[PDB]
Amino acid sequence: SKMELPDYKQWKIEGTPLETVQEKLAARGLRDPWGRNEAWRYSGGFANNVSFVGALLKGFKWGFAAFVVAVGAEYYLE
Amino acid sequence: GAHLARRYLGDASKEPDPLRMPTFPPDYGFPERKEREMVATQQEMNDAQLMLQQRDYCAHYLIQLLKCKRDSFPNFLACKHEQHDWDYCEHLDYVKRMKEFERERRLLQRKKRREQREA
Amino acid sequence: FSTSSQLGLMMVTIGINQPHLAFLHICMHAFFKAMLFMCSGSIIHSLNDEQDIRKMGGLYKAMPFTTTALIIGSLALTGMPYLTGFYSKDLIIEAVNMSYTNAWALLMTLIATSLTAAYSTRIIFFAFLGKPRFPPLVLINENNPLLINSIKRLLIGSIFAGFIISNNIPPMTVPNTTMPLY
Amino acid sequence: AFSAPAAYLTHQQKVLRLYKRALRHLESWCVHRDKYRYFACLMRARFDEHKNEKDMVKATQLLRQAEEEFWYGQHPQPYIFPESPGGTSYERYECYKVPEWCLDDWHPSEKAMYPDYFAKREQWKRLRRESWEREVKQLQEETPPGGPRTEALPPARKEGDLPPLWWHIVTRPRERPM
Amino acid sequence: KDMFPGPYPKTPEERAAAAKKYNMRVEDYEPYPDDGMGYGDYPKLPDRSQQERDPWYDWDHPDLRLNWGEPIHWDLDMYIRNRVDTSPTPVSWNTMCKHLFGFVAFMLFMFWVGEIYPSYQPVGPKQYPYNDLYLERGGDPTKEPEPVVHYEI
Amino acid sequence: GVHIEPRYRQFPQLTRSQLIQAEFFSATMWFWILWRFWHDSDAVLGHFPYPDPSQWTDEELG
Amino acid sequence: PPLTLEAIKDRVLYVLKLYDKIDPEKLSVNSHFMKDLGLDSLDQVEIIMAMEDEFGFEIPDIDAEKLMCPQEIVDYIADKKDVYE
Amino acid sequence: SWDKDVYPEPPRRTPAPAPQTSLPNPVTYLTKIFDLLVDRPVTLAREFIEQQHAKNRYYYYHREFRRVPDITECEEKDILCMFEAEMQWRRDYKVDQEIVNIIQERLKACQQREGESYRQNCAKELEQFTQVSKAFQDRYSDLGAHYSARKCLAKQKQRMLAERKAAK
Amino acid sequence: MLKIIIPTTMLLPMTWMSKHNMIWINATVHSLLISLISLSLLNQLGENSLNFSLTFFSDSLSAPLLVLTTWLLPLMLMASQSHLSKETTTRKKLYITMLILLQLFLIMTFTATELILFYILFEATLVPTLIIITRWGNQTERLNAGLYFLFYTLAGSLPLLVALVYIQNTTGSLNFLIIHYWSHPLSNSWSNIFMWLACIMAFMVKMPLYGLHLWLPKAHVEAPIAGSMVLAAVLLKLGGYGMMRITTILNPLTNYMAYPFLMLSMWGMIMTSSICLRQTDLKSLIAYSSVSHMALVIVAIMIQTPWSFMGATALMIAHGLTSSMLFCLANTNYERVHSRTMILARGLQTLLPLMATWWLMASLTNLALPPSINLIGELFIITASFSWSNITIILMGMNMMITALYSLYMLITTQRGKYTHHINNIKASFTRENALMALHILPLLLLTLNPKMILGPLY
Amino acid sequence: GYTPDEKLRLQQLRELRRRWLKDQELSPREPVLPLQDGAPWVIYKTYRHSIFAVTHVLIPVWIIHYYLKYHVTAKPYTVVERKPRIFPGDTILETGEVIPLMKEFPDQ
Amino acid sequence: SFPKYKPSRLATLPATLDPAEYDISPETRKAQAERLAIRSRLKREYLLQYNDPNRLGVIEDPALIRWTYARSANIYPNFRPTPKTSLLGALFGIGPLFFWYYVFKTDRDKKEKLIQEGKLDQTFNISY
């Protein structure tokens, strides 16, 4: 069950805000050499995260559906 | 908070003083005023162990609410009507106090108008 | 610091001469604040004893259950209606406004409520939202029955205890029935 | 494991330490990784700008002004690694660390609970007891006549000789004793 | 035993002997001013809290950040890591005092102003029956209270 | 016993129970909020009134 | 988290391979940054910071400056974390 | 077995149960379970122990001290009479302390029992303790650590001389 | 009272004629039995004292002190066994005989009916204490400490002797009963002022009073463990008992004369606790703590109110037990490391956990954690002072805060932190030492259940 | 970085430290002292649960109830209960009843 | 030109902002070398005693003994009655005593005056 590290080549600055930072640096003539090391943070499942409003409205869809069902029950029964 | 604005930023004499209220006598204006009748009796209150702050002109509705709450247990959702009744009585008492405040405001303004009439 | 601010709110409630409301706020604060601290402890243990929010990020999906618990706790703390906080804090503020009060005290209480919302936003935004900033080795694992059940009980409490207790307890204060909409 | 300190910090070493502190405080300010990378490359460029100053007085004055800038711009609550000094977990397990000599005071029943380990410990005790005299002799020989002018200690010169003053460093308690 | 601290040094030979006794450099060694306080020979070590000393360095006493044989500060117990700390602050001490004291003063001043101008509601006083609960509030039944009358609005 | 293998630089393994329970409790919170709001609205219990008429309280006018 | 010696070596080499200035092909356990590689002093500081961030433990500057080799970093981390295998 | 006159208790008025909902009352079933599980075994155990005690009933008696001449009638340096009077005064001091304790116990019980109406419905006990406290303070307070019957007599005489001066 | 006195006397021939092996064992058995016999005295009639004979009487004040002494002797023997092992048999027997003579003198002091006999034996207690300090102390300062102790006590006592003889000539008797029953008030005259000073100053020296307390730190630091135990537990309380007994004669002038001593004690408790904050020697810290508690007791006595006296008795007993245990705990570490410097030994909780628990409980009692009898006495004294003046609460509360600070500071420095690396002589705590700490603690916690035993006659 | 002598010393100490750590490992056997109370399979699921329930609540509740019976009788005023809120309604013994006569206005 | 950091007694000046750390001379380096030599000699002696397999007991540090003696014993022999010593002793010794005497005496006199005037409430003050 020994842990296996992922292939180092898979990490890339492309498609990440790190590429935008590198573009700004190249515009000012500088190059950042550590982008690939920080690439993993912006890549994979970590890439997509909800907004604060999205975080608050977690389960609101199912909650609203349950609310509609229960209100239908309450109104229908009487 | 607007009444506070009138009290502080504006002329203080026109606006009523909450501590001093009511300065003018009840007989002034209002040709006939009935005594605020108390529906509940003093013994009833003492027996029901109502809090002194709750021993007001609406203590009867609270007495009924307490009785319904004790009788309804375990069900705690069965006193909504009695709760509404007591709440409305408290609302009306608040409205009456607001009317007292407005009466004091107008009476102070009329006094200021008399003082203006002198000049 | 959130606990200290809530204690100050309770002391204010005592000052407004509304003791039973302060006791109610104590009762609700126990639930939601203990739950928030348990969520913090779970985050710390998952991230190998890391407590700085700057080194914590993107945990919304990494730790779903702790995230739900902390969101609910923050909403209760900030006075989201019909949660535990609503039955206590909303009544606290409403009584403070509708009473003979030091002006600066009332203003500071309102500002403090704003700041409570602010720091709830801070913890949620820096910790659960965004991209991961923790060290490479990912050891996140909340799948422990003790942790899950312990947080579950306080979650259910934060959601429903406010309503249950408020309905059951005898009325001890004359309610502020009518007040301006604002 | 710490190396013996030097009498003074060379100018290069001081510049390195200032660079490390500045990067760490910038990381504390720049919470997000991308912004940190941008401003860190900026700082690296700033160091490279005067990297090759020939006048040592000018470089020293630049160091002084940069240190003043660091003190003004230091993060009020800089990030501290959890086990680092000032960190949350610094010295947390210190009470759990127990010196090895506590073992010799065990009751014979407890020592019989783990015989084999104590045989190994007796072997280590024999080794230390044998090596002490040679270690002292080596320290005398290599020591300058005036006296040890640095905390550095010599390695083992010959086979069969243990490093001088090795016992406590080797037998220091485990970081996580439990 | 010369190791024990002696009187205040007055000759350079005395100063050198004291410096060697306290295992300090002669030029670094500086005895407390002989004003009769009783310090005598003991050196005036810098008032640096043990927090300031570098943690990373291997100290003979790690918890105290002190090495053996080093001269011990007269008020070391005061400047232990668990007690009074003099480590440099990000903000100037005077500025910190200014900000804190000003904040507290303004706070109290504004509270006093709020006392001058207390917030309230545009309502009249709450009216209570039975002469504002005269009896219920502990009023003497034997004595006759003023008959408080509340009329309807 | 390795229920969740620590992953070096990828999204951590999540068991389904975590997701299901978290979603259930968040949905319960939102359902409770909506249900209470629909059944009982704390907005107002009688609009804040103003007694404009002077004759209502006092109308001496001299 | 046993954190064996081989794991430490793999992670150190991983960080170094992710370093753009170092070319991955010639990177070796004994590849001195100063001599075998083209890294300067500031690059040594940066790689030390990267290592300490990867492993989450801070390397003191007096020890940090004297690494100068990936194998030295690996064994230093092993000494700090009490890795004996 | 405490005397009701010594420890008054207002008559108990307990409202009758008047349920208005169909839901079963948990308190009732829990109290019945508590009765069956606890109260009955405890009552049985006390029945057994009371039977055993009744098997061997023996009586203890409350001592009676005849009144003795007070320090007022005791002669000077008359150590025997002074001793008897001083011990009698000490016993009276203890009895007065106990009386104050009884009144305070009534006060506390009345505060708790009345509930939110304590301020009004306990006024009589408050007045009783007021009188008892004033008397006790006048009789015994400020005598000091080395209180003696002679010092109490001296306090009484000082008070009476002040009263005559007030009478002018 | 001879039921206690005569066996205590017989302890001496038994110790002298016992075999060299069995001296400690026999002494401990019979001293514990004597304490069990002394336990009977606790039963005190409320109205009147137990007047056993003309010479001896006991009240609710003397009985707790006698029980404390009889309990303290075996504890002193257990503590002093360790460091006297190397001594020759004759020297060990001499030490034990000094302890037994001290216990005998203390018992006779607390039970004596005549003030002159009380003075004779109360001054007689100096000789065994002085011999103990100056012969079995372990530092060169023991001679100076013994001189200071002896001369302070004698300078206080000799005017007391003159005053007692003058009282015998004037009133005609020094028996405490007769004095209490007749007790004619004093007049505010310079002669009576100086009689008041003469009567009070000997006990004010014995109870370490600020400005007269210099002997106590030297004596307690320089004395052996057993001598420190008696000095802290009973010898200081000798002053409290004397002051409480003697206050009957000086009834009115006390109001005028208390203010100097009252202020001295009230400020001195704060000063001595602040000294405790910065002490570098553990024994010295405990000594200054004792000074502060005794200053509280002095305030209680001078106030002369019933609650003050009850608190004074409770504090006397509780402080005696706490200080004796604290000295024993410090002595254990001193035996292990052979230094009294607080900083030298650190992190002993990891090395010796049960001793750390003993230290915790001892400090908690020292800082008056409720419902300890320490807090009962201190709280009663505080309430009495508040009735005396509401402004006393400021000083009393400040003293309480500083006591908590220094107690927990001693606990933290000695028993917490990293262990001192170089010290290797720490060994598992012996059953004797843990037994001694338990014998100190368990009675103290038990007395909380039935506090009327140590609340004094005025209860 | 280090001087060659420094490198050699560090390597030596490293080897010795790793040797010490590996010597800190125990053997396959942890010797223990050699049936005090018989316990075959004793249903820890429910039987031990019931035993805990009894010993921790039932025994204390019985003891406390007995102490309540003693203490209540031993001294007057030991147990004082708040006078039950007698809302206008039937009483058990007094059977008193009263109505405020809704002397008010119902509309809301 | 960022605002400068004013060092104080409880906020020492950082070594980084030390005006002397950037003004180094050969003699300063010599002094640093000498101090390092002293520390190295002391550390060598301590470690020699500390790693000795034969040693059993404390390593008596002369510095600690000196510190204790200077804090306790050496004070009085090296004390001289001087105007500062005398004035500070007088103040911090007797002044507080007289201050508390004044405060408490005034309070007690006020209370006694009220009691004599019968203008003090002790309605239930029956436990003194």
Supply the DSSP symbol for C39: H
Task: Establish whether chain C is in contact with chain B, requiring a minimum of 3 CB pairs below 8 angstroms.
Answer: yes
Burial of G23 per CB tally in 10 Å (0-12, 13-18, 19+):
exposed
Q: What is the 3-state secondary structure (H, E, C) of chain I?
A: CHHHHHHHHHHHHHHHHCCCCCHHHHHHHHHHHHHHHHHHHHCCCCCCCECCCCCECECCCHHHHHHHHHHHHHHHHHHHHCCCCCCCHHHHHHHHHHHHHHHHHHHHHHHECEHHHHHHHHHHCHHHHHHHHHHHCCCCCHHHHHHHHHHHHHHHHHHHHHHHHHHHHHCCCCEHHHHHHHCCCCCCCHHHHHHHHHHHHHHHHHCCCCCCCCHHHHHHHHCCHHHHHHHHHHHHHHHHHHHHHHCCCCCCHHHHHHHHHHHHHHHHHHHHHHHHHCCCEHHHHHHHHHHHHHHHHHHHHHHCCHHHHHHHHHHHHHHHHHHHHHHHHHHHHHHHHCCCECCCCCCHHHHCHHHHHHHHHHHHHHCCCCCCHHHHHHHHHHHHHHHHCCCHHHHHHHHHHHHHHHHHHHHHHHHCCCCCCCCCCCCCCCHHHHHHHHHHHHHHHHHHHCHHHHCCCCC
Closest-CA residue to B3 (of E123, C99, F45, C95): E123
Contact yes or no for F27 and A44 at CB 8 A:
no
Interface of J with B in 53-92 (CB under 8 A): 82-83, 85-89
Partner-chain contact G21 A36, CB within 8 Å: no
J19 assigned to a ligand binding site: no
- C-alpha span between J1 and G71 (Å, rounded): 12
Burial J25-52 (b: 16+ CB within 10 A, else e): eeeeeeeeeeeeeeeeeeeeeeeeeeee
Ranges assigned E (strand) in chain K:
none
Residue environment code for H137-152, b if the CB has 16+ CB neighbours within 10 A, otherwise e? bebbbebbbbbbbbbb
- Contact at CB, B21 and E124, closer than 8 angstroms: yes
Show Cβ contacts of residue E123 under 8 Å, excluding neighbours closer than 6 positions: B94, B97, B98, B100, B101
Which of G66, G68, G84 is facing J18, going by the closest CB pair? G84
| Residue numbers in G near J23 (CB within 8 A) | none
Q: Dihedral angle at the C-alpha atoms of B9, B12, B15, B21, nearest 10 degrees?
A: 130
Q: How far apart are the first and last CA of chain C?
A: 29
Q: In chain C, which residue's Cα lies nearest the Cα of B62?
A: C171
Catalytic: which of G10, G23, G36, G40?
Answer: G40
- Out of D37, D42, D45, name the one closest to residue A18 (CB): D37
The answer to whether I181 faces chain H, any CB pair under 8 Å, is yes
Q: Residue G22 and residue I354: Cα distance in Å, rounded?
A: 58
Phi, psi of I56 (to 5 degrees): -125, 140
Residue of C nearest to D92 (CA): C49
Answer yes or no: are the C-beta atoms of G82 and J21 closer than 8 Å: yes
Chosen from E23, E53, E56 to mutate, greatest number of chain D CBs within 10 A: E56
Conformation bin of residue H157: beta by default, left when phi > 0, alpha when psi is -120 to 50: alpha
Asked whether the CA dihedral I226, I227, I229, I230 is positive or negative, the reply is positive
| Breaks in chain B after residues (C–N exceeding 2.5 Å) | none
Using the beta-carbon criterion (under 8 Å), do G58 and D83 form an inter-chain contact? yes
Q: CA-CA-CA-CA torsion for B17, B22, B27, B31, nearest 10 degrees?
A: 80
Residue G72 at interface with chain J, using a CB cutoff of 8 Å: yes
Where residue F38 falls (left for φ over 0; alpha for ψ -120 to 50; beta otherwise) is alpha
Helix, strand, coil distribution of chain J in percent, nearest 5: 45, 0, 55
Which chains lie within 8 Å of chain B at 3 or more CB pairs, if any? C, E, F, H, J
Q: Is the CB of C75 inside 8 Å of chain A's CB atoms?
A: yes
Which residues of chain G lie closer than 8 angstroms to A39, CB-CB?
18
Q: Which residues of K touch I287 (CB under 8 A)?
A: none
Enumerate the β-bridge partners of residue I114: I175
CA D95-D100-D106 angle, to 5 degrees, is 100
Backbone φ and ψ for E119, nearest 5 degrees, come out as: -70, 150
Round to whole Å and give the CA distance between I88 and I377: 43
C-alpha dist (Å) from residue K19 to C169, D61, E44, G70, H120: 69, 11, 22, 38, 77
Could you tell me if C51 and D82 are in contact, meaning their C-beta atoms sit under 8 angstroms apart?
A: yes
Q: Do G53 and C135 touch (CB under 8 A)?
A: yes
- Chain F positions touching C140 (Cβ under 8 A) are 12
8 Å CB contact between G67 and G76: yes
> Catalytic site residue G23?
no
Q: Which two tokens stand for residue H126?
A: 């408050």
CB spacing of G54 vs C135 below 8 angstroms? yes
Neighboring chains of A (3 or more beta-carbon pairs < 8 A): C, D, F, G
Q: Do the Cβ atoms of I361 and I441 come closer than 8 Å?
A: yes
Q: Where are the beta strands (DSSP E) in chain G?
A: none
Evaluate whether C159 touches B76 at the Cβ level (below 8 Å).
no
D74 contacts E56? CB cut-off 8 A: no
Q: Hey, what are B73's tokens?
A: 């247990």
Measured distance CA(A59)–CA(C124) in Å, rounded: 17
Q: Are E35 and K84 a contacting pair, CB within 8 Å? A: yes
- Cis check for the bond before I371: say yes or no (omega within 30 of 0): yes
d(CA G34, CA I270): 64
User: CA torsion C50→C55→C61→C62, rounded to 10°?
Assistant: -40
- Residue partners of I122: CB distance under 8 A and separation at least 6: I105, I109, I157, I238, I242
Q: Are C84 and C76 in contact (CB under 8 A)?
A: yes
Do the beta carbons of residue D83 and residue D90 sit within 8 Å? yes
- Sign for the CA dihedral angle at I56, I62, I68, I69 comes to negative
- Chain A residues 12-31 within an 8 A CB cutoff of chain D: 17-18, 20-21, 24-25, 30-31
Residue with tokens 């389904």: F16
Q: For residues I376 and I360, give the distance between their C-alpha atoms in angstroms, rounded to a whole number.
A: 19
Between CA C157 and CA C30 the distance in angstroms is 10
Per the CB < 8 A criterion, the answer to whether I308 and I301 are in contact is yes
State the helix-helix crossing angle for H40-55 and J59-74, rounded to 10 degrees: 50
Q: Residues F42, A77: contact at Cβ < 8 Å?
A: no
Q: Which residue of D has its CA nearest to K18?
A: D64
- The approach used to solve this structure was cryo-EM
C-alpha to C-alpha distance for I285 and I273, rounded to whole angstroms: 9
Which helix (H) or strand (E) segment is D23 a member of? helix D11-29
* Neighbour-count burial of K55, counting CB atoms closer than 10 A to its CB (0-12 exposed, 13-18 middle, 19+ buried): middle
Contact check, Cβ <8 Å, C135/G11: no
Identify which of G28, G25, G5, G22 has the alpha carbon closest to the alpha carbon of residue G74: G5
